[PDB]
């Protein structure tokens, strides 16, 4: 009585042959994973940076942004391992545009087959220039269409507590960051990393698009992302110290999101959070292994203009350069301290 | 790479043929929905009570429990609309038994096909005696196996914020209670009821076991459940008032969970919460339209070693049957007194 209908869906396998990854795409995705792993598990002293638009609504703008970020990445690679945020799925407070896959025309017509085709072509396009990508894993079915291209998955603050998402993460072939809860505390993200590291059994959709029972092996590459929230921002030294105190043995390093709760509703704060995070890193803080930044070609946001976000406000490209070059410098200073 | 393997799964349609609902089961599920709707939307001045075990691990003990509840329910039906908690799916803090579907043998063998058979067979058994059931809709796939039998769904505190669960609720053909967040605040449940009231378009599994694009119509029968949390319990008149102040026009009545965060680590607190909720109801509080209670044959809980003690929860601690009966009779008395105030 509350289903209007069901519309046919191309299977993940079909979409994969219709939009094949190139050899460069596959290699890039594998490289982003290895580099991300090496950083969060403490094998490498660089910082893992997940940086880019809040959401992707426009493939051509995403490509321009990617080409700039790939160049800067090549400049800063001795110090930062940079993965582009190419987020396809957006969790809403109540209702609103859910992203590229859900409604690619952004006009409430919801052509999910086209959204999947655009998302995959986008992920091929970005990785084919040698730039790794990451996305929030909101839908538990869409990763079958796209995982082969993905180097990093986030679980958003609103789903970190969800058993289905901990299950999903336990089977993903790449590192997964759990955002702290929207109340600003970390316990649910700590719990989520514990849960995701275990093997799970649950019903899931396969590559031929039918439901089956999946057994996962557990994902040892999950980590907490500090993203602020109602109790306050948590990118400062006390917050980091409190976080480190709640991490179990075996934990991976922490990532700090400069945006969302940590920006206090003003995207212009991201470079201020950077300064505070840089000061900790530069002076010897080794538990901070990652950062996340909402960045776009042009700054701010707009309601539903080229290179301007239609979801959260982002810093613009030039501020992005200055932020990442500062962070790289802090990484070099931490290396000095650690000698 | 982190996928150990895939095992075949019977489709919802196949299981439904294999384990058909009886005409009594079906009418029972429909009646439970009607009564719950009429209560949360203010048509009926009885209270909707979702009561029963934290989880079901034993079909035969659930059946004995269901028979006692159906008896008491027939006695108290002028005042209380009763739906049994028959919870199949358990969200864990980190890890632990996820319930009857996931591991019906409770021994880490995860025979999910047998779990879905046991669950469906259980749902037909309980509803076939005229007692409506409710469950937490934790899995977004399993409701295709079972929804024909279900009169109430809960979205748990840990999934009330999840867009997937709000999408799920928007296409369910029964009322859905969204618990407040584990931090004890209710904005996320209020936001959830708004989200689930809209049509959504998302990928989901159909009765033939294949993925397709689902379009839902939106669910106007969603309501907030107050279940306490970090900030403190929230069953008292001030919390209730604060809850009513956040509800938008068009909102349904509130439900109060006597257990979980509202019982402060102690199942013995459930009757204390009952007393405070009853005082509010008996004195004219009309926005409280529902309550939820973790109740079993016997009180308390036990660890999982089969060597299990009969009629005792293997998840959260419950009040035993005898306490349950006292609580429910007192709640019916408050409903009666509320009717006097309203005249
Ligand atoms: Mn954002
Ligand atoms: Mn419980």
Curated annotation (Swiss-Prot), chain B:
EC number(s) reported in the record: 2.5.1.54
Regulation: Inhibited by tyrosine.
InterPro entries: Aldolase_TIM, DAHP1/KDSA, DAHP_synth_1
Coiled-coil intervals, chain numbering: none
Gene Ontology biological process terms from the UniProt entry: amino acid biosynthetic process; aromatic amino acid family biosynthetic process; chorismate biosynthetic process
Pathway noted in the entry: Metabolic intermediate biosynthesis; chorismate biosynthesis; chorismate from D-erythrose 4-phosphate and phosphoenolpyruvate: step 1/7
Catalytic activity: D-erythrose 4-phosphate + phosphoenolpyruvate + H2O = 7-phospho-2-dehydro-3-deoxy-D-arabino-heptonate + phosphate
Pfam families: DAHP_synth_1
Inducing stimuli: By amino acid starvation.
Keywords from the named record: Acetylation, Amino-acid biosynthesis, Aromatic amino acid biosynthesis, Stress response, Transferase
SUPFAM superfamilies for this protein: Aldolase (SSF51569)
GO molecular function: 3-deoxy-7-phosphoheptulonate synthase activity
Gene Ontology CC terms: cytoplasm; nucleus
Domain of life: Eukaryota
The protein's role, per its UniProt record: Stereospecific condensation of phosphoenolpyruvate (PEP) and D-erythrose-4-phosphate (E4P) giving rise to 3-deoxy-D-arabino-heptulosonate-7-phosphate (DAHP).
Family affiliation: Belongs to the class-I DAHP synthase family.
UniProt-listed NCBIfam families: aroFGH, PRK12755.1
Miscellaneous: Present with 26300 molecules/cell in log phase SD medium.
Name this polypeptide is given: Phospho-2-dehydro-3-deoxyheptonate aldolase, tyrosine-inhibited
Gene source species: Saccharomyces cerevisiae (strain ATCC 204508 / S288c)
Organism phylogeny: Eukaryota, Fungi, Dikarya, Ascomycota, Saccharomycotina
Gene behind this protein: ARO4
């Amino acid at each position: 009585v509350r289903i209007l209908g069901y519309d046919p869906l191309a299977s993940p396998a079909l979409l994969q042959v219709q939009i094949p990854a190139t050899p460069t795409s596959l290699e890039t995705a594998k490289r982003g994973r290895r580099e991300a792993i090496d950083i969060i598990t403490g094998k490498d002293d660089r910082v893992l940076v997940i940086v880019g638009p809040c959401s992707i609504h426009d493939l051509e703008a995403a490509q321009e942004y990617a080409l700039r970020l790939k160049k800067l990445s090549d400049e800063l690679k001795g110090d930062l391992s940079i993965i582009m945020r190419a987020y396809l799925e957006k969790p809403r407070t109540t209702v609103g545009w859910k992203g590229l896959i859900n409604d690619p025309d952004v006009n409430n017509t919801f052509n999910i087959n086209k959204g999947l085709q655009s998302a995959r072509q986008l992920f091929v396009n970005l990785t084919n220039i040698g730039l790794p990508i990451g996305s929030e894993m909101l839908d538990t079915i869409s990763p079958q269409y796209l995982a082969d291209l993905v180097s990093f998955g986030a679980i958003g603050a609103r789903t970190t507590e969800s058993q289905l998402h901990r299950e999903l993460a336990s089977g993903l072939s790449f590192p997964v960051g759990f955002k702290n809860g929207t109340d600003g505390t970390l316990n649910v993200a700590v719990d989520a990393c514990q849960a995701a590291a275990h093997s799970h059994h649950f019903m899931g959709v396969t590559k031929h698009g039918v439901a089956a029972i999946t057994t996962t092996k557990g994902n040892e590459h999950c980590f907490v992302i500090l993203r602020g929230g109602k109790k306050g921002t948590n990118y400062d030294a006390k917050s980091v110290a409190e976080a480190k105190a709640q991490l179990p043995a075996g934990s991976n390093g922490l990532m700090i999101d400069y945006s969302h709760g940590n920006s206090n509703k003003d995207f212009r704060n991201q470079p201020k959070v950077n300064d505070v995070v840089c000061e900790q890193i530069a002076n010897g803080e080794n538990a901070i292994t990652g950062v996340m930044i909402e960045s776009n070609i042009n700054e701010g946001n707009q309601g539903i203009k080229y290179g301007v976000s239609i979801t959260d406000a982002c810093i613009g490209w030039e501020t992005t350069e200055d932020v990442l070059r500062k962070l790289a410098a802090a990484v070099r200073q931490r290396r000095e301290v650690n000698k």
